[PDB]
């Protein structure tokens, strides 16, 4: 028989941070939908001018309502354009993670804690999503990746391994690899029990002693 | 500690068949090397004219020696250009598979036997390569995929699953996904024993009753 997409996929967020290339946003939507993910958040885009986008929109933290993604993005999304139309555009990674319980930063050994592969981290993400918790995968700038404050806002380090002597994986290929891994694991059996983990907003409150007893 | 690339990777071949876009050859090399694969075979390329390749080379089955890949391919390969320089260019999928023992056709349900995922097929490929056997992953034309005679030349059907309602994975992303899967499994323990499986050339001989007793 044929398996339906698990509902828990609706709880997985793809988060793109400080994106330069409008095309990459389009690719990301295309990669996501193909692997059954529909929830995209764009955080502080700094879109460069391209052959297809002479005039990149400029992002305004005070007036997010004005922000319109370039035609180029929509073009590259194809039949995944809906995903872009439903994207949350947001000014801080904090706001984007507000209600998530797990958030993986994609980085490389540019240095300190243990990195985990998508193979190893996806099970934990899937169970969490299955429990009704929002979970997120966070991607940084094409050139710069995630700043160290961005990385610190996440509670998991994710790496994609490969050839130690040569490694060249662009952001679209990285989003593709991660969405593939996620989907590749949806044949896992899931226990339906009774959970509550704290969200990122709640964790911020507690660290700042802003909780109310 | 840090793991070296397994030598058995040297026995895995990526085979690209009836490729239209010169860029895709470049992408494939880049995707491969990043995941520690170095062996590319190009079979009957039919390169289309692009903005960067006004004059695609025309492939001649009788004079393979003349065939030079466009600059565009080399450009897109980056620091994986060596892989393209070491590519075997060949006229038939038969010649390309001649000395392999396993060969996976990448296709979709355009119809009859069971398809296997890269997750499920890679173990078998890795053990085989580990035994010293050559093994191959076969990719068809961007528009047309593998002809039915091509598929029949392979002894495994490989599919990449995703969203049943929308699936859009280009050839570069497909090569990327497959190389990732391969590498993602190189942490598997391998038994060193004493093997012999028949190669594809040998299997052709036997079916045609051309063996010598």
The set of residues, in sequence order, having a beta carbon less than 8 Å from that of A53 and lying 6+ positions away, is: A22, A47, A70, A71, A72
Q: Is residue B113 part of a domain?
A: yes
CB contact B169 to A (< 8 Å): yes
Q: Is residue B194 part of a domain?
A: yes
Which residue from B169, A40, B166 is spatially nearest to B158, judged by alpha carbons? Answer: B169
The set of residues, in sequence order, having a beta carbon less than 8 Å from that of B41 and lying 6+ positions away, is: B13, B14, B15, B16, B87, B88, B89, B90, B96, B136
Strands B134-139, B100-106: pairing kind: parallel
Residues in chain B: 213
**Chain-centroid distance, C-alpha B116:** 16
Q: Which residues of B44-63 are buried (b: 16+ CB within 10 A; e: fewer)?
A: bbebeeeeebeebeebeeee
Q: Is residue A90 part of a domain?
A: yes
The number of domains in chain B is 1
DSSP A117-169: -HHHHHHHHHHHHHTT-EEEEEE-BTTTB--HHHHHT-SEEE-----TT----
| Residue B102 structure tokens | 């396993």
Residue with tokens 């000395």: B99
Best of B118, B176, B178 to substitute, by most chain A Cβ atoms within 10 angstroms, is B176
Strand partners, A149: none
Q: Rounded distance, CA B102 to CA B125, Å? A: 7
Contacts of B39 in chain A (CB under 8 A): none
In this structure, the number of other CB atoms found within 10 A of the CB of residue A52 comes to 13
Residue with tokens 């993400």: A125
Q: How many CA atoms lie within 13 A of A172 on its CB side?
A: 21
Q: Contact A26/A17 with Cβ under 8 angstroms?
A: no
Which residue from A97, A92, A90, A102 is spatially nearest to A157, judged by alpha carbons? Answer: A102
Q: Contact A14/A37 with Cβ under 8 angstroms?
A: yes
| Residue B26 structure tokens | 């470049």
Q: What is the resolution of this structure in A?
A: 2.6
DSSP A5-24: PPGGGGGEEEEEES---HHH
Q: Is residue A89 part of a domain?
A: yes
Residues in chain A: 213
Rg, chain B, Cα only: 17
| Residue B79 structure tokens | 């620091």
Q: What is the separation, in whole angstroms, between the first and last Cα of chain A?
A: 51
SS3 A89: strand
Q: What dihedral do alpha carbons B29, B31, B37, B39 form, nearest 10°? A: -20
| Residue A132 structure tokens | 């009704």
Strand partners, B141: B145
Strand partners, A119: none
Q: Do A5 and B79 touch (CB under 8 A)?
A: no
The B residues from 21 to 40 touching A (CB cutoff 8 Å) are: 30-31, 33-36
In this structure, the number of other CB atoms found within 10 A of the CB of residue A174 comes to 23
CA distances A6 to A113, B103, B147, Å, are: 32, 32, 33
Q: Contact B168/A77 with Cβ under 8 angstroms?
A: no
Q: Do A5 and B36 touch (CB under 8 A)?
A: no
Q: What's the 3-state SS for A43-80?
A: ECCCCCCECCECCCCCCCCCCHHHCCCCHHHHHHHHHH
What range defines the domain where residue B126 resides? 7-205
Q: Rounded distance, CA B125 to CA A37, Å? A: 30
Q: Do B33 and A168 touch (CB under 8 A)?
A: yes
Burial of B137 (0-12, 13-18, 19+ CB in 10 A): buried
Q: What's the 3-state SS for B152-190?
A: HCCCEEECCCCCCCCCCCCHHHHHHHHHHHHHHCCCCCC
Task: Read off the CATH number of the domain in which A127 is found.
Answer: 3.40.1280.10
SS3 A116: strand
Interface A–B counts its CB contacts (< 8 A) at 74
Q: Rounded distance, CA B175 to CA B156, Å? A: 17
| Residue A117 structure tokens | 């592969």
Distance from CA of B81 to the nearest CA of A (A): 12
Q: Contact B24/B72 with Cβ under 8 angstroms?
A: no
Q: Is residue A212 part of a domain?
A: no
Residue A209 is classified by DSSP as: T
Q: Rounded distance, CA B73 to CA B80, Å? A: 11
User: What are the two backbone dihedrals, phi and then psi, of residue B107, each rounded to the nearest 5 degrees?
Assistant: -145, 180
Q: Contact B82/B28 with Cβ under 8 angstroms?
A: no
Q: Rounded distance, CA B45 to CA B145, Å? A: 13
CB contact B188 to A (< 8 Å): no
Distance from CA of B157 to the nearest CA of A (A): 17
Contacts of B79 in chain A (CB under 8 A): 166, 168
Q: Is residue A211 part of a domain?
A: no
Residue with tokens 């095309």: A23
Q: Do B169 and A119 touch (CB under 8 A)?
A: no
DSSP chain B: --PPPPGGGGGEEEEEES---HHHHHHHHHHHHHTT--EEEEES--PPPBTTBSSPPPP-TT-GGG----HHHHHHHGGGHHHHHT-EEES-HHHHHTTEEEEEEE--S---PPPB-HHHHHHHHHHHHHTT-EEEEEE-BTTTB--HHHHHT-SEEE-----TT-----HHHHHHHHHHHHHHTTTS--------PPPHHHHHHHHTT----
Q: Do A34 and B117 touch (CB under 8 A)?
A: no
**Chain-centroid distance, C-alpha A184:** 17
Q: Is the Cα dihedral B102, B105, B109, B112 positive or negative?
A: negative
Q: Rounded distance, CA B101 to CA B193, Å? A: 18
Q: Contact B94/B103 with Cβ under 8 angstroms?
A: no
Residue with tokens 């806002």: A153
The set of residues, in sequence order, having a beta carbon less than 8 Å from that of B194 and lying 6+ positions away, is: none
């Amino acid at each position: 028989l044929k398996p339906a997409l698990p509902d828990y996929l609706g709880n997985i967020r793809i988060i793109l941070t400080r994106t330069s290339h409008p095309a990459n946003i389009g690719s990301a939507a295309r990669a996501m939908k193909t692997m059954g993910l529909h929830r995209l958040t764009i955080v502080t885009p700094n879109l460069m001018a391209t052959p297809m986008t002479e005039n990149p929109p400029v992002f305004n933290p005070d007036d997010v309502q004005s922000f319109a993604l370039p035609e180029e993005s929509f073009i590259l999304a194809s039949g995944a354009a809906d995903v872009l139309h439903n994207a949350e555009i947001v000014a801080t990674l904090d706001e984007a993670l507000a209600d998530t319980t797990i958030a993986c930063a994609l980085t490389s050994r540019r240095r300190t804690a243990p990195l985990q592969t998508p193979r190893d981290l996806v099970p934990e993400l899937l169970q969490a999503a299955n429990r009704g918790e929002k979970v997120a995968l966070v991607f940084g700038n094409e050139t710069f990746g995630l700043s160290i404050e961005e990385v610190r806002a996440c509670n998991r380090l994710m790496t994609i391994n490969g050839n130690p002597d040569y490694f060249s994986l662009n952001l679209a290929q990285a989003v593709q690899v991660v969405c593939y891994e996620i989907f590749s694991q949806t044949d896992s059996p899931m226990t339906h029990l009774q959970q509550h983990a704290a969200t990122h907003e709640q964790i911020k409150g507690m660290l700042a002693h802003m909780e109310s007893v």
